[PDB]
Design an enzyme around this catalytic site. Structure first.
Site, mmCIF file in Angstrom:
data_model
loop_
_atom_site.group_PDB
_atom_site.id
_atom_site.type_symbol
_atom_site.label_atom_id
_atom_site.label_comp_id
_atom_site.label_asym_id
_atom_site.label_seq_id
_atom_site.Cartn_x
_atom_site.Cartn_y
_atom_site.Cartn_z
ATOM 1 C CB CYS B 109 -0.965 0.004 1.193
ATOM 2 S SG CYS B 109 -1.897 1.552 1.343
ATOM 3 N NE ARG B 112 2.570 0.591 3.539
ATOM 4 C CZ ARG B 112 3.677 -0.143 3.599
ATOM 5 N NH1 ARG B 112 4.020 -0.723 4.746
ATOM 6 N NH2 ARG B 112 4.441 -0.297 2.506
ATOM 7 C CD1 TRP B 281 -6.939 9.449 -1.262
ATOM 8 C CD2 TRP B 281 -7.890 9.536 0.769
ATOM 9 N NE1 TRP B 281 -5.975 9.818 -0.367
ATOM 10 C CE2 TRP B 281 -6.525 9.881 0.888
ATOM 11 C CE3 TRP B 281 -8.676 9.507 1.913
ATOM 12 C CZ2 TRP B 281 -5.941 10.215 2.109
ATOM 13 C CZ3 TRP B 281 -8.097 9.848 3.134
ATOM 14 C CH2 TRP B 281 -6.742 10.191 3.217
ATOM 15 C CD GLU B 286 -5.807 2.879 -6.310
ATOM 16 O OE1 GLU B 286 -6.152 1.759 -5.902
ATOM 17 O OE2 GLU B 286 -5.912 3.907 -5.601
HETATM 18 C C1 HEM Z 1 -6.057 6.466 2.362
HETATM 19 C C2 HEM Z 1 -5.887 6.384 1.043
HETATM 20 C C3 HEM Z 1 -5.277 5.128 0.365
HETATM 21 C C4 HEM Z 1 -4.642 5.172 -0.799
HETATM 22 C C5 HEM Z 1 -4.386 6.448 -1.641
HETATM 23 C C6 HEM Z 1 -4.221 3.833 -1.115
HETATM 24 C C7 HEM Z 1 -3.538 3.476 -2.248
HETATM 25 C C8 HEM Z 1 -3.307 2.168 -2.548
HETATM 26 C C9 HEM Z 1 -2.904 1.681 -3.846
HETATM 27 C C10 HEM Z 1 -2.693 2.559 -5.089
HETATM 28 C C11 HEM Z 1 -2.752 0.366 -3.733
HETATM 29 C C12 HEM Z 1 -2.375 -0.593 -4.860
HETATM 30 C C13 HEM Z 1 -3.763 -1.084 -5.233
HETATM 31 C C14 HEM Z 1 -3.726 -1.666 -6.600
HETATM 32 O O1 HEM Z 1 -2.928 -1.169 -7.427
HETATM 33 O O2 HEM Z 1 -4.515 -2.602 -6.836
HETATM 34 C C15 HEM Z 1 -3.077 -0.043 -2.379
HETATM 35 C C16 HEM Z 1 -3.041 -1.324 -1.880
HETATM 36 C C17 HEM Z 1 -3.432 -1.719 -0.615
HETATM 37 N N1 HEM Z 1 -4.011 -0.926 0.347
HETATM 38 FE FE1 HEM Z 1 -3.970 1.018 0.308
HETATM 39 N N2 HEM Z 1 -4.622 2.961 -0.108
HETATM 40 C C18 HEM Z 1 -5.306 3.744 0.824
HETATM 41 C C19 HEM Z 1 -5.904 3.295 1.988
HETATM 42 C C20 HEM Z 1 -5.856 2.048 2.544
HETATM 43 C C21 HEM Z 1 -6.537 1.628 3.763
HETATM 44 C C22 HEM Z 1 -7.422 2.562 4.615
HETATM 45 C C23 HEM Z 1 -6.240 0.324 3.949
HETATM 46 C C24 HEM Z 1 -6.639 -0.642 5.085
HETATM 47 C C25 HEM Z 1 -7.176 -0.231 6.253
HETATM 48 C C26 HEM Z 1 -5.372 -0.093 2.844
HETATM 49 C C27 HEM Z 1 -4.840 -1.334 2.642
HETATM 50 C C28 HEM Z 1 -4.262 -1.732 1.451
HETATM 51 C C29 HEM Z 1 -3.794 -3.057 1.169
HETATM 52 C C30 HEM Z 1 -3.874 -4.230 2.175
HETATM 53 C C31 HEM Z 1 -3.285 -3.039 -0.062
HETATM 54 C C32 HEM Z 1 -2.657 -4.205 -0.834
HETATM 55 C C33 HEM Z 1 -3.648 -5.341 -0.871
HETATM 56 C C34 HEM Z 1 -3.218 -6.353 -1.868
HETATM 57 O O3 HEM Z 1 -2.246 -7.091 -1.586
HETATM 58 O O4 HEM Z 1 -3.861 -6.430 -2.937
HETATM 59 N N3 HEM Z 1 -5.172 0.981 2.028
HETATM 60 N N4 HEM Z 1 -3.401 1.097 -1.676
HETATM 61 C C1 LIG Z 2 -5.976 -8.457 -7.923
HETATM 62 C C2 LIG Z 2 -5.381 -7.153 -8.417
HETATM 63 N N1 LIG Z 2 -6.201 -5.956 -8.123
HETATM 64 C C3 LIG Z 2 -7.645 -6.236 -8.170
HETATM 65 C C4 LIG Z 2 -5.826 -5.366 -6.823
HETATM 66 C C5 LIG Z 2 -6.540 -6.047 -5.667
HETATM 67 C C6 LIG Z 2 -6.458 -5.254 -4.392
HETATM 68 C C7 LIG Z 2 -6.673 -5.946 -3.222
HETATM 69 C C8 LIG Z 2 -6.628 -5.297 -2.011
HETATM 70 F F1 LIG Z 2 -6.819 -5.978 -0.878
HETATM 71 C C9 LIG Z 2 -6.367 -3.952 -1.963
HETATM 72 F F2 LIG Z 2 -6.320 -3.324 -0.777
HETATM 73 C C10 LIG Z 2 -6.154 -3.248 -3.124
HETATM 74 O O1 LIG Z 2 -5.917 -1.909 -3.018
HETATM 75 C C11 LIG Z 2 -6.852 -1.011 -3.607
HETATM 76 C C12 LIG Z 2 -7.107 0.212 -2.761
HETATM 77 C C13 LIG Z 2 -7.605 0.091 -1.470
HETATM 78 C C14 LIG Z 2 -7.847 1.235 -0.724
HETATM 79 C C15 LIG Z 2 -8.392 1.124 0.677
HETATM 80 C C16 LIG Z 2 -7.593 2.479 -1.275
HETATM 81 C C17 LIG Z 2 -7.099 2.558 -2.570
HETATM 82 N N2 LIG Z 2 -6.845 3.767 -3.122
HETATM 83 N N3 LIG Z 2 -6.877 1.434 -3.276
HETATM 84 C C18 LIG Z 2 -6.204 -3.889 -4.360
#
Ligand code: HEM
Ligand SMILES: CCN(C)CCc1cc(F)c(F)c(OCc2cc(C)cc(N)n2)c1
Ligand code: HEM
Ligand SMILES: CCN(C)CCc1cc(F)c(F)c(OCc2cc(C)cc(N)n2)c1
Ligand SMILES: C[C@H](O)[C@H](O)[C@H]1CNc2nc(N)[nH]c(=O)c2N1
Ligand SMILES: C[C@H](O)[C@H](O)[C@H]1CNc2nc(N)[nH]c(=O)c2N1
Ligand SMILES: [Zn+2]
Lengths: 419, 413
Positions: B109, B112, B281, B286
């Protein structure tokens, strides 16, 4: 026992058994992944200096075994004679010498094994110049010049590697001190800024300190700094008619040629170490052709490189107040259009990142078909722009270290004792 | 003992000690690296004891009460429940701390820097799908906040025997439906074709449009999942237009404002929360790169390039690259004009470096997945590209889990 890799765009799953032949550590463990560390490991197959017999011979036996296996032998008369000849040679000289076939096989396979190289579909089509008879910097200059001329081929670039004498004891290394055969100088300006290529300011300074007279321009081709048999390195000016350059222009932006940009056509890496059966070729300059992004994204747009993004965006009349206008991204695309357009207009071999990455997928598929795997470093294979719209982004890759290989080595000036 | 990561753009070098506390596998071995593998490969009493202790220890350490009276009684209390009930119940403070730290530990993520500002909605008293719907509706309304998006997680009851799982069958709370046509074409989001079919089979009457918000498919206590329509007034959407191309709005593109992942598993002290939808957000890429331009997704590159009069005969014209930037400009411009929180990939990656440096300073490291942190476009012109990163697995963690339709055993004859 057998690891699968999946392409998430096509759902092609490939099964990897070649990693069972992996010899040296990646740097990763079950508990930590080092896949984005530039130099994750110092695990080397032999100790630092002239190794004992029980150190060098097992590596030698491994490679000779691999080569004779590769040619549908193993156990043949010539293989069993080769082992004993390598055995006697190490017994009497602490090293051994590769046959021309083995050298060529080893060099092609180090390219084949280069997990960071996206261009490996070409790997078996490498021209190998044996320079192991070289003795002086002048000889190295001569060899390198012939390399550059052959490889450039008036724009129809040809992949080539020139292999200088292997390391013996460590105090007689052959080195090309240049990191690449052709690079532009970098000048620390009085104010504080930098003229030319900022990556090369230190190498440029050594060259000046070594007596090079800098023209002090933005695209001054650096001299060669050649070290033979451990002696002090020597400066040579590559004849400019051998250095093919492309003036960068744009197919729509006519003002773009007025940026005064050019680049050289021959990428030629010259600071790496080629390891074959425990032998270490510390001078092995090799060249192919550019993927346009190397120049257009990294050379031109890295902040600590030529850093031209702002000036291009200026000329494009872009919203440069805030990041969210994506002015950097827009100029970046136009710069890479111009780079490809210019190279193609001058009939200088170049490949775009779409073609190159598609080729690499095909190479992976070929390798999994015939070899059981293909070591690939996703961090390096994915192009530095538009990653996800290239096929390699969606392609899982297993990274492992096969031998023969190209290895990093210390910069000579960190280690060389001047005479 | 120590590990260093270098930034090759800045030469900054950070020293990671936090990795010494990792415990889950990365998937790599000493001889193979699996850094680009998407998914590399119920607890008993004796399994649960050390996991619980480890988490309670870390919690009391975080609040500078390690070794205290309260710490020692909590440990003893947790042990009682594991002995009595084969499981235990987190206190509210522990639930909030655990959820925040699963975010803080999400190596993939980039957002963070905000990890500690997570609104945690405790829904462990929920017992039915209607109840989950109510919780999720409130989650959405709170998170959406009329465009001023706020991070939030709603945590439903933990796994017990694995036969009574709570699941949101949706991969995300808001997603558009996908319908395959007889002629092979796809209407809507081709990613969601399978899940749209599940919904239709469950009784959902689809509008069969390009941007039908899917219904929630909610599973409580291991029962068959049940369909609920999110109230349309709670689904904030943004029509995509371009600041320069008047014709861009004519593509009819829109996107929802709230990214809310709902298929993950939250693991805290060995407890498994199989339904824990969380939201934040968007980063523009994305939507603008992945949602819109992945060949498997909305795939609007050719269409946009067409309207841009781009030469689409040769790749080396970089028409895809050029069209991709414009689409992502439109995405950011649209959200900003509508005052819906979004972050561009330059701002996001820059904040993540600040975050990562702070985390090295105050925590001893920051597990990060370079393959995921680097945006899917313009990779090297963002600072994270040049940032070496160590990846390792800390707990609390978000974990993947099987899709529910692959595991659910249906009750309704
Ligand atoms: C606050 C604004 C946030 C932004 C801008 C953000 C941005 C991102 C982005 C761009 C990704 C890659 C997602 C993708 O490309 O599919 C990601 C992954 C992820 N985010 Fe964040 N995120 C945010 C909040 C959060 C929150 C609130 C949580 C959990 C409480 C979280 C947990 C995760 C996790 C666990 C992943 C990776 C999950 C996976 O392995 O697919 N995120 N985030
Ligand atoms: C399988 C490949 N693809 C579908 C990504 C899957 C995936 C799984 C996951 F648990 C994620 F948290 C994730 O992050 C997207 C995300 C989450 C949040 C809270 C914010 C933003 N801005 N973006 C994306
Ligand atoms: C023929 C056309 C070739 C193309 C298009 C190509 C492309 C590339 C690119 C884009 C990289 C990443 C470079 C960077 O970002 O700095 C790379 C790395 C590399 N290439 Fe190739 N390459 C080609 C030929 C060769 C040849 C002929 C050799 C050796 C015989 C070779 C060996 C390597 C190695 C070892 C690396 C790893 C670089 C490192 O670790 O620093 N390549 N290649
Ligand atoms: C991480 C190290 N990085 C800063 C080096 C950047 C760089 C500068 C340069 F001048 C180069 F020629 C260069 O060659 C890579 C290369 C090699 C070959 C054989 C073919 C292609 N196509 N490309 C790489
Ligand atoms: C094969 C590769 O691991 C896969 O495409 C990954 C690459 N990096 C990614 N990065 C992010 N942020 N999201 C993704 O889905 C992916 N996909
Ligand atoms: C930290 C990171 O590993 C470093 O910036 C890498 C990333 N990927 C790369 N990929 C290529 N092809 N070339 C590079 O120099 C780099 N740099
Ligand atoms: Zn790894």
């Amino acid at each position: 026992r057998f690891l699968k890799v999946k392409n998430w765009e096509t759902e092609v799953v490939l099964t990897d058994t070649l990693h069972l032949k992996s010899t040296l550590e990646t740097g990763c463990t079950e508990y930590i992944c080092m896949g984005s560390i530039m130099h994750p490991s110092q695990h080397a197959r032999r100790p630092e200096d002239v190794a004992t017999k029980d150190q060098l011979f097992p590596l030698a036996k491994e490679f000779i075994d691999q080569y004779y296996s590769s040619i549908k032998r193993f156990g043949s008369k010539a293989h069993m004679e080769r082992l004993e000849e390598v055995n006697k040679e190490i017994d009497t000289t602490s090293t051994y010498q590769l046959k021309d076939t083995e050298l060529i096989y080893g060099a092609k396979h180090a390219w084949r094994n280069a997990s960071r190289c996206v261009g490996r579909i070409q790997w078996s089509k490498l021209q190998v110049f044996d320079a192991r008879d070289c003795t002086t910097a002048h000889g190295m200059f001569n060899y390198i010049c012939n390399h550059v001329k052959y490889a450039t081929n008036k724009g129809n670039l040809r992949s080539a590697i020139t292999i200088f004498p292997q390391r013996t004891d460590g105090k007689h290394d052959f080195r090309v001190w240049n990191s690449q055969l052709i690079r532009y100088a970098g000048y620390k300006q009085p104010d504080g800024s930098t003229l030319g290529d900022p990556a090369n300011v230190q190498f440029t300074e050594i060259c000046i300190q070594q007596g090079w007279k800098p023209p002090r321009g933005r695209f001054d081709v650096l001299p060669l700094l050649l070290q033979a048999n451990g002696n002090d390195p020597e400066l040579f000016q590559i004849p400019p008619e051998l250095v093919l350059e492309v003036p960068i222009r744009h197919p729509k932006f006519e003002w773009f040629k007025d940026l005064g940009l050019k680049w050289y056509g021959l990428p030629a890496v010259s600071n790496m170490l080629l390891e074959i059966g425990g032998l270490e070729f510390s001078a092995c300059p090799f060249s192919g052709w550019y993927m346009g992004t190397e120049i257009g994204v990294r050379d031109y747009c890295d902040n600590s490189r030529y850093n031209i993004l702002e000036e291009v965006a200026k000329k494009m009349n872009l919203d440069m107040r805030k990041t969210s206008s994506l002015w950097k991204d827009q100029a970046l695309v136009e710069i890479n259009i111009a780079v490809l357009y210019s190279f193609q207009s001058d009939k200088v071999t170049i490949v775009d990142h779409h073609s190159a990455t598609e080729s690499f997928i095909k190479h992976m598929e070929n390798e999994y078909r015939c070899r059981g795997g293909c070591p690939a470093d996703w961090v390096w294979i994915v192009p530095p722009m538009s990653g996800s719209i290239t096929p390699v982004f969606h392609q899982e890759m297993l990274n492992y270290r096969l031998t023969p290989s190209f290895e990093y080595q210390p910069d000579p000036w960190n280690t060389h004792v001047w005479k």
